[PDB]
Structures are given as C-alpha cells and as structure tokens.
Amino acid sequence: QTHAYHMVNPSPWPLTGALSALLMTSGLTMWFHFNSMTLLMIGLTTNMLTMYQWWRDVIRESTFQGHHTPAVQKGLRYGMILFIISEVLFFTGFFWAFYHSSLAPTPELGGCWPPTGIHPLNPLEVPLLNTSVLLASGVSITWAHHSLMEGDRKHMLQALFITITLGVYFTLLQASEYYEAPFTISDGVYGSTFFVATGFHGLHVIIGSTFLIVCFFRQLKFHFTSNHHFGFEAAAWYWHFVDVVWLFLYVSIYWWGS
Amino acid sequence: FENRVAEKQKLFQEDNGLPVHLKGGATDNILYRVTMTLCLGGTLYSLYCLGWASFP
Amino acid sequence: MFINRWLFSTNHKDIGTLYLLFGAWAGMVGTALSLLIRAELGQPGTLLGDDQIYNVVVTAHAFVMIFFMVMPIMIGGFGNWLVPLMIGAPDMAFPRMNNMSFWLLPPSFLLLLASSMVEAGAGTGWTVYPPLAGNLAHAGASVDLTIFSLHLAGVSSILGAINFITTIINMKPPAMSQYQTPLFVWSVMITAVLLLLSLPVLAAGITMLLTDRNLNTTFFDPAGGGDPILYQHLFWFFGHPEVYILILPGFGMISHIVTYYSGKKEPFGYMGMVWAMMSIGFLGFIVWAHHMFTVGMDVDTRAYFTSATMIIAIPTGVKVFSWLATLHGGNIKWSPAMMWALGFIFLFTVGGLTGIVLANSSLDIVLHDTYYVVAHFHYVLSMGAVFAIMGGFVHWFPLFSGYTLNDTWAKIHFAIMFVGVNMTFFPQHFLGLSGMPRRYSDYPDAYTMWNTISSMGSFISLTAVMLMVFIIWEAFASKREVLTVDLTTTNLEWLNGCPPPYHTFEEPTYVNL
Amino acid sequence: YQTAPFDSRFPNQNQTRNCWQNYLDFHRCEKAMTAKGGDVSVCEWYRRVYKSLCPISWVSTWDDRRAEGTFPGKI
Amino acid sequence: YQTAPFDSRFPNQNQTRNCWQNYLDFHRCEKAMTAKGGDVSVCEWYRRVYKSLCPISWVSTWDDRRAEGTFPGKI
Amino acid sequence: GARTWRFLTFGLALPSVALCTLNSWLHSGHRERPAFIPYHHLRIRTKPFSWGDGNHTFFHNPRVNPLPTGYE
Amino acid sequence: GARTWRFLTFGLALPSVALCTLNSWLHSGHRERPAFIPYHHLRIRTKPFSWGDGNHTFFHNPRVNPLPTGYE
Amino acid sequence: MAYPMQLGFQDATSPIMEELLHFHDHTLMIVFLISSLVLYIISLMLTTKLTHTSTMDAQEVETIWTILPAIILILIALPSLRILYMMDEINNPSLTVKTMGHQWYWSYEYTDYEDLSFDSYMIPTSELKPGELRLLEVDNRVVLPMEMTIRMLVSSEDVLHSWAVPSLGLKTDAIPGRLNQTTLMSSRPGLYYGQCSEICGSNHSFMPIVLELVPLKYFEKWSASML
Amino acid sequence: YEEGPGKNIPFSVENKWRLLAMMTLFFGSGFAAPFFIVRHQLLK
Ligand code: HEA
Ligand code: HEA
Ligand SMILES: CCCCC/C=C/C/C=C/C/C=C/C/C=C\CCCC(=O)O[C@H](COC(=O)CCCCCCCCCCCCCCCCC)COP(=O)(O)OCCN
Ligand SMILES: CCCCC/C=C\C/C=C/C/C=C\C/C=C\CCCC(=O)O[C@H](COC(=O)CCCCCCCCCCCCCCCCC)COP(=O)(O)OCCN
Ligand SMILES: CCCCCC/C=C/CCCCCCCCCC(=O)O[C@H](COC(=O)CCCCCCCCCCCCCCC)COP(=O)(O)OC[C@@H](O)CO
Ligand SMILES: CCCCCC/C=C\CCCCCCCCCC(=O)O[C@H](COC(=O)CCCCCCCCCCCCCCC)COP(=O)(O)OC[C@@H](O)CO
Ligand SMILES: CCCCCCCCCCO[C@@H]1O[C@H](CO)[C@@H](O[C@H]2O[C@H](CO)[C@@H](O)[C@H](O)[C@H]2O)[C@H](O)[C@H]1O
Ligand SMILES: C[C@H](CCC(=O)O)[C@H]1CC[C@H]2[C@@H]3[C@H](O)C[C@@H]4C[C@H](O)CC[C@]4(C)[C@H]3C[C@H](O)[C@]12C
Ligand code: CUA
Ligand SMILES: [Ca+2]
Ligand SMILES: [Cu+2]
Ligand SMILES: [Mg+2]
C-alpha cells in the first residue's frame, strides 16, 4: 500500500458479536416468558468475550503493530464523536418521555407532578452529592489528560485513579439511593421515567468507569505516548458525556421534577 | 513496573502469517475456541428453544 | 479460506455482496407476504379464516421490505460496493465493524420469523402502537421478539452510519473537497446522518414498550399516567426520517444512471442536487406529526405540520427538474437501467404528489387509515425504492460480477414490472377516496372490483420477480466477460475493471490542487 | 340546559381535563355544601356538565375510588 | 374560632398569598351562593381567615377595585 | 497546564465533594414511612416480574416499598 | 470554508428569513383593541414623562395604547 | 356508503365534507397537471437527435423551479388552512354524544339529561335481513337529529380504535384515557356508514358505525321511548 | 483469495445446472417461507 489506512486482518469477532446479540435478545425473551436465564447468561458471556478480544486486537494493531497513522486516528475521532451523538439522541427519547408525562399530568396521577402518593428524593441530599462527584471527576480527568500530554506518568495515574474512584462512588451512592427509594419502577410513569432514565445513565457510568479502568491498566503498561493516546481521549469524551447527561437528569427529573 | 512495549511490538510483528487475533500464541486459540463454541452452541440452543416455543 | 473470506470479511466488496444476497432473499420473503395479502383481498369473504394471521402477514411484509430488503440493498450493498470505489478509498474506515453491521441482520431476521412462529404472531402493524402491542392485547413473546429484531437492525444501521460518515469525511483524496464527491456518495452521507439521529429515538421508544410489557412501567399506559400518543411521537420522530432514508440512496443512484445513459459527464446542477438532498434531510425531522392528524392534536399544530410538510416539495422538485435537465440534450442510450430510472422519475412524482394531498390535515381526516395512504407510499416508496434498486442492479451488475446481462430480457422484465405495479396500486386511490380502510382482512361488497383488479396486478409483478431470477441465472450461466465500458472518465467505480480486484486503490489516485 | 357549552379553558380536541375539572368542581362543591349542611342545588351546573361530557366508566371508577379512599385528586 | 390556623399551603414567613387566597375564596363562594340565592353563611371560614390575616388597607383597596371593575383576580 | 488542573482537583473539586458528603451524612437518618394507600396508579402489576414470587420489585426494600396489598 | 458558509447563508439562513417573513406577512393586519379597564397595575404614572404633555409614553400609539383615563 | 366502481369520495352529507370535495377537486387538478407535465417533459427530452452535452448553467432555471412550486404550494395551503380553521370555529352544539371503542364493537352514551347507553355490534353475514349490507349493519344505530350541531366525544375502554364516517368528513381516534371531540352536522336524514379506522386486532374489519339521522321531533320521541 | 469473474462470490458458477439448483433452493426457500409460516399458524 502507499496510503496511510488500515487493512484489518480477517476477524471472527463481528460474527461472535452478532451471535452474542442473538443470544442476549433470545435470552431476554426466554427470561421474560419461559422462566429461564440460560441463553441470557451464554449471551452475556459471549458478548464480554467478544468485546475483550476485539478491543485487545485494536491495542495489538495500534500500540504493538503501528497501524494507527494520523489518518487512522482522525477516523477513530470522528467515529467516537458520532457514537456519542447517537447516545445523546437515545437519551433525548427518555427526556421526551419525562417532559411529556410531567408537563401534562393525567387525572390518574391526580392531575399533578409529582403524582399523588409519590414522595420524591430530596435533590439537596445524595443527588447533590452525586452531582459534586461527577463534576469533580470531570476536573480530575482533565488533570490526567494534561499530565499525560506533559509526560508525567505518576500524576496521570493518580488523577485517573481519582477519576475512577469518583465513578465508583457515584455508582455505590446510586445503588444505595435505589434501595432506599420509597417508590419503584412500578410506581406509574413517575417511577418509570425515574428508573429507566437514571438506570440507563448508571449503565453508562459503569461502562465509562470500565473504559477508564482499561485506560489505567494500559497506562500502567506504558501503552500511551505523550502525543498518541486516543483510547484515553475517547474515554475522557465518553466520561464528559456521562457527566453532562447527569446534569440534565439532575435539573430535569430530580430538581424541576420534584 | 517497566516499559515492555518493545518486546510486545517484536511478538506482534513476527513474520509468522498469523492473523492479529491469534498472534499472541496458544492462549488466543483457546479463548477463540471457547468463544466460538459458546456462540455456535448457544445459537443451536436458541433454534431448539424456537422449535419448542413454536407449538403449545 | 471460505470461512475466512465470507464469515470473517474485512473487505467492502465482499460485505457489499453479502448485503445484496441478503436483501435479494429478504425481497422474496417480502414479496411472498405481499401476495398473501393480495390473495386475501382478491375476493370478498375470508380466505385465511384467521384475521389475526392476516394482520401478522401485513406487519411482517412491511418489516421485511423496509429493514431486510431496501436498507440492506441500498446502504449495505450499493453503499459498501460503490462508496469506497467512487472516492478512491482502499476500504471503509472500520472494515471489521462493517462486517458486524452485516452479521447482525440474519439474527435480526431470525427474531422476526420467531415472532411469527410463536403464539399468534405480532398482528400490530409495523407501527407496533400500544395498547394493541402491549401485554394484554398481545400477551406472549411475539411483540418482544419483534422489538428485539428492531434493536438488532437498529444497531446494525447505527454502526453502519458511523462507518459511512467517517469514510466519506475522512477517506477522500486530499485534493477532493466534499463538493467534488459524486452525488451517490452525498446521498449515502445524508442517509447515514438521518440514521444516526433517528434510530436512537426509535430504540428509546421500543425499549419503553418492552419495559411496559415486562417490567411494569407505564410510559404508554394511562392507568400509570402514561399516554399511548407519546409512543406515536417517538415512533414517527424516527419514522418520517426513515421514509427519506429509504429513498435518498435511490435519488443518488438515479442521478448516476440518468447522467450515464444521457451520455453526460455530469448531472445538471450538482450543487442544487446537494442542496436539495440536505434540505430534504433537514425538513425530514420537523414534519413527523402528519402521521397523527386524527389523534386529537391542537389546530395550530395541525396548521404547522401541514405547512412544513408541503415545503419538502420545493427541494424535491429541484431534483426532479434536474434529472429532466440531465436528459436534455443527451445522446440517450435506451438501456434497461435507463428504463428503470425513467419509470422512477414518473412513479416517484405521482407518489410525491399524493403525499402533498395527504399533507393537508383537513383532507387527511378523510384519507388517513385508508387505501389512499397505501397507494401513496407504494408509488413513492415501493415503486421508487424498487425501481431505483432495479436500475442500480442492472447498471452495476457487470461491475460487481464481471458478466453482462441479456439486455432484451432485462427490458422484458422492466415492461412486466411496470404493468404489474400500476395495475396493483393505481386502483387503491379509488378504494381510499371511497373510504376503504387499510389493515382490513375483508371489505364491504362495494369495494370488490378495485380489490379484484389490484390482486390481479400483484400476480403480474410475481411473474416479473420470477423472470428476474432467471435473467440473473442466464448471465452467470453464459459467462459473457466485460471488455470495455464507456464514460470511465466520470465513473471512477468502473476504472479498476469488472469485477475490480479484492484490494483496489492500494496505490491511491493522484489528484493535484 | 341542553348540553355543556363551549368553555374557553378547554378549547381543543382533547376534552379530558374539561370532564375531570367539572367532576372535581361538583364533588368539591357537594362536600362544601354538606360540611355546613348547606344545599347541593348550588352544585347543579358542575353536575350537568360532567354528566354530559364524562364517560360513564370514568365517573363510575372515580366514584368507586372516592369510596375506597384511593381517588388521587383533592376534594 | 380564635385565629387563622397554620396552613401547610403557606408555611413560610411571607403570608401575602394566604391573605389573598382567603379573600378570593370568600368572594368566589359569596358569588356562587348569592347567584343561586343560597346561604353566604357557608363562606364564613374564608371570611374569618382573610379578616384575621389581611391588612385593613388591602381589603379596603380590593373591595374598592371589585366595585370599580378593576380587581385583577378572578371571582 | 497539569499543575492548574491538579490545583482545581484538590483546591475546589474534592473540597466540594467533602462538603456535599458532610451535608448528605447530616441528613442520612430514616424518614417515617407514609401511611399505605392502595392508589391504582402505583404498585402497577400488568405482568409478574421474572424473579422471586413475581410481585417484588428488583431492589425491593421492605421498610419503604409496600406491595399492592400493603407493607410486608 | 467560505464556500460552505455561503452555501449555508443562501441555502438555509436566507430561505428561513424568507419563510418567516411570509408567516409574519400573512398574520399581520390589526386585531381589534380590547375594552379599556382602568387597572391600577397598568398605565403607571408616579412622575410625568420628560416629553410631550408628561402623560404619553415614548412610542405612544393612539390606536392601541390607552391613557390612564382611556383611549384618546 | 360507497357503491360499486366508485372513483371518488362518497357524496357530502355535511357542509365541511362539501368544502373538502371542492378542495380535493382544486388539489387534484394541480396533481394531474404536474404529473402530466413531468411525463410530457420526459417524452420531449427523449424524442430528439439534437444534442448539447457540454456543461449547462443551472442558476437561471433554478429560480423558476423554486418560485413556481412555492406559489403552487401557497395556492393549496390557503384554502387548506381556511377549511382547517372552519372545522375548529366555536359552535354551540345542542347535543353531546359519547362513543367508546371496544374489541370489537362501539358503545354510545347520551347523558345530557338521562343515563341512556347501548352497545352497537356488527350484524353477522349469516343474520343479515334481505337487502342489508355485508360488514356494515349494526343492531343499534346511532340515532341523531338532522340539521343540528352535535358534539361527539370519542374514547376507548381497551386498545386504540378510530371512529369514522366518510360522508360526514369525520375520523377521530379513540384513545383510552383521552376524550377527543369532533362536531357532526348532517344536512340530510338517512343512514350514514363508517368503519373502525385504527388497527385494533383480529376484528378491526368488523366493528362499523351506522348513524340514523331523523328530524328533531323523531329524535325526541326516540329519546323519550328509551326511558 | 481467487480474483475475477465467478471467483468473487460465495457460490460456484463452474456448472450452470448446479448453479440453477443452488439459485432455486436460495430464492425458492425465501419465497416459500411465508406460505409455510401461515400453514403453521393455521394448523394451531
Ligand atoms: C419498501 C417497502 C415496500 C415494498 C417494496 C412493498 C411491496 C408490496 N406491497 Fe406493501 N407495504 C409496505 C411496504 C412495501 N410494500 C408497508 C410499510 C406497509 C404497511 C404495513 C402496515 O400497515 O403496518 C405495506 C402494506 C401493503 C398493503 C396494505 C395491507 C393492508 O393495509 O391490509 C398491500 C395491499 O395490497 C401491500 C402490497 C404490496 C405488494 C403487492 C408489493 C409488491 O408485490 C409490489 C412489487 C415489488 C416487488 C415484487 C419487490 C421486488 C424486489 C426484490 C425481489 C428485490 C430484488 C433484489 C435485488 C435485485 C438485489 N403492501
Ligand atoms: C420513499 C418513501 C417516502 C417518501 C419519499 C415520502 C414522501 C412524502 N410523503 Fe409519504 N409516506 C410513506 C413513504 C414516503 N413518503 C410511508 C411508508 C407512509 C405510511 C406510513 C404508514 O402509515 O405505514 C407515508 C405516509 C405519509 C403521510 C401520512 C398520511 C396518513 O397516514 O394519513 C403524509 C402526510 O403528509 C405523507 C406525505 C409525504 C410528502 C408531502 C412527501 C414528499 O417528500 C413528496 C415530495 C415530492 C413531490 C411533491 C413530487 C416531486 C415534486 C415536483 C415535480 C415539484 C412540483 C410539486 C409541487 C408544486 C407540489 N406521507
Ligand atoms: C446503580 C446504577 C445503575 C444500575 C444498573 C441496573 C442494574 C440492574 C440492571 C441493569 C440494566 C439497566 C438498564 C435499564 C433498563 C431497565 C431498568 C433499569 C433501572 C433499575 O435498576 O431499576 C430498578 C428496577 O430494575 C428492574 O426492574 C430490572 C432490571 C433488570 C432487567 C432489565 C432488562 C431490560 C433490558 C432492556 C434492553 C434494552 C437495550 C437497548 C438496546 C438499544 C440499542 C439500539 C429499580 O428498582 P425498584 O425496586 O423498581 O425500585 C427501588 C425501590 N427501592
Ligand atoms: C429599538 C430598540 C433600541 C432602543 C432605542 C430607543 C429608545 C431610547 C434608548 C434606549 C436605551 C435602552 C434602555 C433604556 C431604558 C428605556 C428604554 C427601553 C426601550 C424603549 O424604547 O422603550 C420605550 C419607552 O422608551 C422610553 O421610555 C424612552 C426613554 C429614553 C430615555 C432613556 C433613559 C436612559 C437611561 C440611562 C442608561 C444607563 C446606562 C448605564 C450603563 C452602565 C454603567 C455602569 C417603549 O415605548 P412605549 O411607548 O413605552 O411602549 C410602546 C407602546 N406602543
Ligand atoms: C461489569 C461490566 C459491565 C459493563 C459491560 C459493558 C461494556 C463495557 C465496555 C467498556 C468499554 C471499553 C473500551 C476499551 C477500548 C480499548 C481499545 C482502545 O482504546 O483502542 C485505541 C483506539 O481507540 C478505539 O478504538 C476507541 C474504541 C472506542 C470504544 C467505545 C466504547 C463505548 C462502548 C459502549 C457500549 C454500548 C453501550 C450502549 C448501552 C445501551 C487504541 O489507540 P490508542 O489508545 O491511541 O493506542 C495507540 C498508542 O499506544 C500508540 O502510541
Ligand atoms: C437488548 C440487547 C440488544 C443489544 C445488542 C447489542 C448489539 C451488538 C453486540 C455488540 C458487540 C460489540 C463488540 C465490540 C465492537 C467494537 C467496535 C469498535 O470499536 O469499532 C471501532 C470503530 O468504531 C468506533 O471507533 C466508534 C464506535 C464504537 C462502538 C462500540 C459498540 C456499540 C454497540 C451498541 C450501541 C448502540 C447505540 C446506543 C444508542 C442507540 C474499530 O473499528 P474496526 O473496524 O474494528 O477496526 C479499525 C482498525 O483500524 C482499528 O485498529
Ligand atoms: C456450549 C453451548 C451451550 C449449550 C446450551 C446448553 C443448554 C442447556 C440445557 C438445559 O435446559 C434447561 O433445562 C432446565 C430444566 O429442564 C430449564 O429450567 C427451567 O424450566 C423448568 C421447567 O420445569 C422450571 O422448573 C424453571 O422455570 C426452570 O428450572 C431451563 O429452561 C433450560 O435452559
Ligand atoms: C509505585 C507505582 C509506580 C508505577 C510505575 O511507575 O510503574 C505507583 C505510581 C502511581 C501509583 C498509583 C497512584 O498513586 C494512585 C493510587 C494511590 C493509592 O494509595 C494506591 C493505588 C494507586 C492506584 C497507586 C498504585 C501504585 O502505587 C502506583 C501505580
Ligand atoms: Cu376497532 Cu379497528
Ligand atoms: Ca378474501
Ligand atoms: Cu412522514
Ligand atoms: Mg391511524
């Protein structure tokens, strides 16, 4: 070749990923209808194996084999931005459901929001702490980024460890909130909008945290150069996305919706 | 820890004709065989489940 | 080597070939479902004796034609084959992710055919509105399997959109601006942006339906303070962009075919064609509630949606008139592909105009949920998409295969298909104006004559499909290998021969400033 | 009284809140007129309007819920 | 009746809306009762509460404005 | 620079978290649960849940989450 | 690029202004003025204005702006 | 009702259906002309040996191609929106009737004065009286006064349905938890038929609407008999 | 991998009659499937 693009070795992971999607969906069906978790656990296992080996291979291709020229890296930047945009529009649908229900509360609710019989969480207690935690994690991940660019291994690792710690703290606080909440997913459209929107956000916090942990271990193994660290940049962009979605949830569901 | 990236560059650039998913050695083969066996077996199981669920 | 090549592909051409084979098979499924619809409607009284089965057949017909025939053929097949070739790129940006967009479709299709095989199927319509699609009125796994089919199709197209947008932005020759890319490449980029933005909203909506059915949420259940109409907003916020997704790559292929067989180096008014597609894409996001004129929305809302909808006719008319102005002064080659494209311009125009009739909410009160709507979309979508696909298929078949079609057979095929689709769908306008509802297994006796004629037309189109399979067989049977093709100076996809080597543009093109 | 007249508060196709508001108004008034042993004839306009507009099954469900202590509106 | 009880609708230092609400409630009730020729005695609670809470000059100004046709609240 | 973002991390961000932690931990005591009312818009059951006895939510808390028939 | 921003100027921005100009155009023409009511929170006069007779607002429109004593 | 070999709308029974007929005639003339012009121009482009294959300037013609369609759309939208705002204008109905959709039949409630209600089921083909219409008759018709403004309120007790009567210009979705309003005014006595117009499951084809329009005096006698 | 006409496809065109069998099974399976699904639903 006399172009700078990456001709990828033939790979089984697209097919294993597609089959993992079949097993997870047929598995959810078999859990919801036929009282059985077997297909679902095979699908979750094969999905995790597929993601592990696929992203391992991307590290092999880039850090170990040198395939990520500037042109390839520019492609991956566009890819991650477009992926984040798709995730924003997914959340938009849940915000639309929330505002539809809350702005025009039906007679069944008592014609009010929150509905009769719903006792919302105090937004000034754990939800405010959760806000301070994710905002703080946006500051620490920016410190990590600058440490890496400046060639500082020790301070990149300390800043990234602090970011992950705050992500875990948010997750344990939210798990505690979930358990303590006097309303449930079955508490009409209030519970529905609350748990599905914050639940998908909590999933994205766990995903984002897992991505940062992958970056932590790659940094421990000296994979990143001071100039070339797109996995770190992508994890940072994703993490900022998770923060911003939280700020919109906090203002919309916890504060305005109380 | 020590920077061992040069040693991994040498392993993954060896002229042995292996595709990148198998180039780490025997462990890659084992993990690939586990993954593909679970996917194909799982898929066969999902078809049996379809057969079962298609009748009262 | 076979498994490595066809199951483990990282090659844009082979993945395009898999998409074309997948879409052609799906088209047979969708056509069989369409003939079962028309066999039931061919005579008054019941044929199937099971109107839930009729409703399942209509629902499956739509999902198969949209998600498994049109989108895989236009975007996965023509998109993967042609986009990299037309910009001199060595592959897609994400050649391995590309393969996963393909392999998600067979499992997606398996979930749809599981929906129809368990319980009494999903007899919901392709809109899947609650509460009919909920766990009381559709108890059991069928609707859940339909929702999961759409999740896998959705992920396939979202990842494919990311791949096409990145490829088209990042992998052109450094001298080539966006305003030096062929219109087919523009049409795919714009389709991909619509997919990226619309499919996540559908995914949110059908996920809510899944949780209402299985986790005791009440997004769409008034007993919990939910609203069935919220589902409709989320569905159609996706669904209007979806109908432009279905036609845009067709518009791109038509621009190339009309230009090629007019003997022109270029389409008339290139920047107006780009403007028109971007305008259609943008306006496509602000019109969705014209699918909801009878649900009880406010008069000012109906006034806004009527007006915004009619605006789409302006950029659309620029494209129609630009195709006509590309013909103008041409040395016309009356190839079978040109016939498909001329058929497209006329039939698309008829269906677009019945769309403008429906845009008027006042009249839509009387035409909504009637055969007038079915007539509209089988002109603009069914004939538009199908005629663009058939034009593209017979034009680019020799590029993909290395073999020529029999042009006389291909013209016979066009003639039969033109008679069949018009005999099928033209009378449905009369059925709609006279008030025959859509989604009906049987009809008052007055509607018999036009339903009889429509069903007779459906058999004519069947004869065309069967002939198409024979024509493809005859080309591979005879093995006439391509020697020369004209106009390669303005059709880069041909310049590496027929078929092009597995790896093309290993040495990139030279383009200076 | 023939039927419920146009109400400028509820001018659009969706009349749910018109039915609901007049049911609430009738029951709030009835409770005020019984809570001094007052007279429920004062509440007649609201009764005629909700009876005209509200589906029988809605009225019947709301009545059952008031009797159960599960009516979610304030009376 | 000694004075206006605590009202959970108006739990804070600013009692302006409490005075206003009870003045409106009294006059809305008095209108609904005079109009059928029913008994203004059913309105008495609202009267006692607004008289307890509302400055004399506010009530006087609001009365003048109702007589003038310039009262900006809905009665 | 890295120095500035570390200064913001330790001098602004983590002190904020410490103060919100103190705020939360001051109001962490259990609130008295409200009387049970079998409202029809709450405790929705259109299909049994796919776990336990089908009638308990996934993070059911006996102290604060009544069943359709009331507190356990 | 300049080419792209010109395309947006002429292909989106000015067509938008033309559509909104039509919309405004169509909904213009004077609506009937409301009955005058001498509301005490409107037509405020705590000090005469520093122009005219002290009682006319700066862009007073006789057709739609009553004085404290009503329409002119 | 529709009749065999019908090409257009059912004859108008209400002033707003009349308006829609005139509006459709106007819009269809435009559809015909534009369809015909495109077919004609295709034939004109294809029927000459004369050629011009060099680059053509598009700027001048694109003004015609945008301005002329813009004018045409305005000429459709003006009368379109006039009718829309007429079918919204405040009227004094003299009667309110509710209809509730069910799987698979309609119920009607006339609760202005007495609690009158009844179910309306399709007459099965095996039970039709000679000369009665397959899939269109019901056991209990919606008796209404002619030449009077009637408020119809539409809802559902289960899934979505849609209450339609083409000859009156009427189609209003029946949504559980929602009360949708439409106005009905018949210029004529007689029987006026419609059919459920939102897919509601297996018997969607089999839950029709029949209005029976009679003079006020006969409507009053019928109401009184119901007691 | 093999290059050129008849070599860039996952099916053989070496023999036109074997090809006719494969294309018949391929398109015929797709066309038949809905008829058999309807039969399956009717037979419940
Ligand atoms: C792309 C979309 C598309 C296509 C192509 C078609 C094609 C056909 N459709 Fe339909 N149809 C829909 C989309 C489509 N349809 C949708 C969305 C609905 C609404 C469902 C609902 O109400 O919920 C619907 C509903 C619908 C109804 C209304 C049913 C009812 O309301 O009860 C009818 C009635 O006759 C009908 C008939 C047909 C017929 C006879 C064909 C065809 O037979 C016409 C001829 C076309 C072909 C035969 C296709 C040929 C193409 C190929 C075989 C691919 C070849 C591939 C390669 C060359 C690579 N379809
Ligand atoms: C290819 C797919 C496709 C395309 C491109 C379109 C294009 C348009 N559609 Fe259609 N539509 C569907 C597929 C499509 N539609 C489907 C599938 C449904 C039904 C969904 C369901 O319910 O299942 C549907 C339903 C649908 C409805 C809902 C009707 C109802 O359910 O009651 C409406 C309402 O306004 C609408 C309008 C339009 C308009 C105005 C266009 C415009 O974009 C058309 C513009 C084109 C032209 C006007 C022709 C060319 C222009 C000229 C030659 C210039 C001169 C013209 C004038 C001055 C008018 N369509
Ligand atoms: C702590 C922070 C984050 C934690 C994340 C959640 C943990 C468990 C499950 C994880 C997956 C969550 C994602 C969102 C899905 C739905 C519900 C999740 C929100 C949640 O956890 O909600 C809980 C209920 O979970 C439930 O029902 C059951 C939940 C389990 C079943 C969910 C199955 C549905 C899967 C939907 C798949 C859709 C995928 C979308 C693909 C789109 C691609 C285009 C709330 O508990 P509760 O007792 O009702 O109230 C508390 C009372 N004290
Ligand atoms: C079209 C938009 C442009 C506005 C230009 C036109 C008018 C004058 C200039 C405006 C400057 C901006 C704000 C000043 C305050 C008031 C003017 C507000 C805008 C205006 O023009 O308001 C008009 C009133 O103007 C009046 O009183 C006019 C009063 C004129 C004297 C102004 C007094 C100046 C105040 C001092 C400014 C201090 C700035 C301090 C800066 C910070 C330093 C630390 C409205 O007309 P009307 O008849 O009441 O109603 C319409 C009925 N048909
Ligand atoms: C218990 C846990 C439960 C949760 C499980 C669910 C999933 C969790 C997954 C978390 C994601 C981990 C992603 C790891 C990616 C590692 C590979 C990587 O980062 O690869 C990098 C490229 O980036 C790239 O491909 C970028 C790759 C981007 C991947 C983006 C991933 C977001 C995934 C979201 C999943 C979908 C969620 C939707 C839910 C509804 C490699 O380039 P560099 O870094 O420049 O290195 C090269 C230098 O060394 C040279 O000097
Ligand atoms: C109810 C349950 C149903 C759900 C079914 C789940 C569906 C499928 C199973 C998913 C299995 C995923 C396995 C990992 C995929 C990793 C893809 C990836 O990371 O793709 C990358 C490209 O996309 C990029 O960057 C940016 C994009 C990264 C995307 C990662 C995958 C996301 C999958 C789900 C998200 C849907 C979106 C949510 C919003 C709707 C890399 O591209 P390649 O061509 O590989 O390599 C190119 C080489 O140059 C690299 O060296
Ligand atoms: C390497 C490839 C992977 C291959 C996959 C292996 C497939 C394993 C077969 C086991 O099948 C299981 O049998 C269980 C017992 O027969 C079922 O239990 C369930 O069904 C029972 C029916 O009696 C109920 O008691 C309960 O719901 C529950 O225990 C369960 O559904 C089913 O999965
Ligand atoms: C001693 C070791 C050196 C790493 C190296 O340069 O190889 C240091 C450098 C940065 C350290 C990490 C950072 O200080 C952040 C964390 C500090 C915690 O107190 C222990 C874990 C923690 C995650 C540390 C583990 C380990 O001590 C690291 C990894
Ligand atoms: Cu009821 Cu369709
Ligand atoms: Ca029949
Ligand atoms: Cu639309
Ligand atoms: Mg409808």
Q: What is the 3-state secondary structure (H, E, C) of C77-137?
A: HHHHHHHHHHCCCCCCCCHHHHHHHHHCHHHHHHHHHHHHHCCCCCCCCCCCCCCCCCCCC
Active site residue C236: no
Resolution in A: 1.7
- Find the catalytic residue in C17, C124, C198, C255: C255
Closest by CA position to C40, among listed C27, C26, C50 = C50
- The answer to whether F57 contacts A31, with C-beta atoms less than 8 Å apart, is no
Residues on chain H touching C222 (C-beta within 8 angstroms): 176-178
Q: Are residues H165 and H107 in the same domain?
A: yes
Domain that holds residue F18: 1-72
A and B touching (3 or more beta-carbon pairs closer than 8 Å):
yes
Domain that holds residue I44: 1-44
Residues on chain A touching C10 (C-beta within 8 angstroms): 7-11
What is the atom index within ligand 9 of the atom nearest the CA of H159?
1
Q: Per the annotation, where are the binding residues of H for Cu cation?
A: 161, 196, 198, 200, 204, 207
Domain that holds residue H135: 92-227
At the second CATH level, the architecture of C2-513 is Up-down Bundle (1.20)
Q: Establish whether C507 is an annotated binding residue.
A: no
Chain E contacts in chain D segment 26-55 (CB below 8 A): 29, 32-33, 35-36, 38-39, 41-42, 44
Closest by CA position to C451, among listed C437, C431, C429, C434 = C431
Min distance D65 CA to chain C CA atoms (Å):
13
Last residue of a domain, one of H91, H116, H147: H91
**CA atoms E13, E16, E17, E22: torsion sign:** positive
ω into residue H104 within 30 of 0, thus cis? yes
Chain H contacts in chain D segment 10-69 (CB below 8 A): 11, 13-16, 18-19, 51-57
Residues E28-37: contacts with CB under 8 Å, at least 24 apart = E28/E75, E29/D32, E31/E75, E32/D29, E32/D42, E33/D42, E36/D39, E36/D41, E36/D42, E36/D44
Q: What are phi and psi of A249, to 5 degrees?
A: -65, -45
Q: Six-digit token pair at C293?
A: 């004129």
Ligand 11 center to C239 CA (angstroms): 7
Q: Are residues H205 and H188 in the same domain?
A: yes
**Nearest bound ligand to the CA of residue C379:** 2
Task: Tell how far CA I6 is from the center of its chain.
Answer: 17
- The structural domain count of chain I equals 1
Mutate to test the interface with C, among G4, G7, G14, G20 (most CBs of C within 10 A): G7
Ligand 12 center to C370 CA (angstroms): 9
d(C-alpha A95, C-alpha A109), whole Å = 19
Report the residue of chain G nearest C282, measured CA to CA.
Answer: G12
- The structural domain count of chain H equals 2
d(C-alpha E71, C-alpha E58), whole Å = 12
Ligand 11 center to C289 CA (angstroms): 7
- The structural domain count of chain E equals 1
- The structural domain count of chain F equals 1
Beta bridge partners of residue H100, listed in sequence order: H107, H155
Q: What angle do CA E58, E60, E66 make, to 5 degrees?
A: 100
What is the atom index within ligand 3 of the atom nearest the CA of F59?
48
Domain that holds residue D40: 1-75
Q: Establish whether C441 is an annotated binding residue.
A: yes
Beta bridge partners of residue H110, listed in sequence order: H116
Collapsing DSSP to helix, strand or coil, H98 comes out as strand
Active site residue C340: no
Ligand 7 center to A192 CA (angstroms): 31
Q: Establish whether C240 is an annotated binding residue.
A: yes
> Ligand 3 pocket, C203 CB below 6 A?
yes
| CB-CB contact of H6 with C434 (8 Å) | yes
- Find the catalytic residue in C119, C438, C463, C474: C438
> Ligand 4 pocket, G65 CB below 6 A?
yes
| CB-CB contact of H71 with C348 (8 Å) | no
Q: Are residues H182 and H196 in the same domain?
A: yes
> How far separated are the first and last CA of chain E, in Å rounded?
26
Q: Per the annotation, where are the binding residues of H?
A: 161, 196, 198, 200, 204, 207
Collapsing DSSP to helix, strand or coil, H116 comes out as strand
Please enumerate in sequence order all residues whose Cβ is within 8 A of that of B26, keeping only pairs 6 or more positions apart, or say none: none
Last residue of a domain, one of H33, H58, H91: H91
Give how far Cα H180 sits from Cα of C223, D55, H177, H202, Å: 18, 11, 10, 24
Ligand 1 center to H175 CA (angstroms): 29
d(C-alpha D50, C-alpha D64), whole Å = 16
* Helix (H) or strand (E) segment spanning residue H151: strand H150-156
Question: Structure solved using which method?
Answer: X-ray
Q: Are residues H216 and H137 in the same domain?
A: yes
Active site residue C157: yes
Give the residue, by CA position, lying nearest to ligand 2 atom 44. C352
Min distance G13 CA to chain E CA atoms (Å):
43
d(C-alpha C314, C-alpha C297), whole Å = 26
Chain I neighbours (≥3 Cβ pairs under 8 A) are B, C
ω into residue C499 within 30 of 0, thus cis? yes
Active site residue C242: yes
Helices (H), chain H: 15-45, 59-86, 216-225
Closest by CA position to C290, among listed C243, C249, C222, C245 = C243
- Find the catalytic residue in C12, C151, C264, C290: C290
* G37 lies within 8 A of chain E by CB: yes
Q: Are residues H97 and H48 in the same domain?
A: no
Mode of pairing for the β-strands spanning H105-110 and H95-102:
antiparallel
Q: Six-digit token pair at A83?
A: 């992926």
Cα dihedral F33, F35, F39, F45, rounded to 10, equals 50
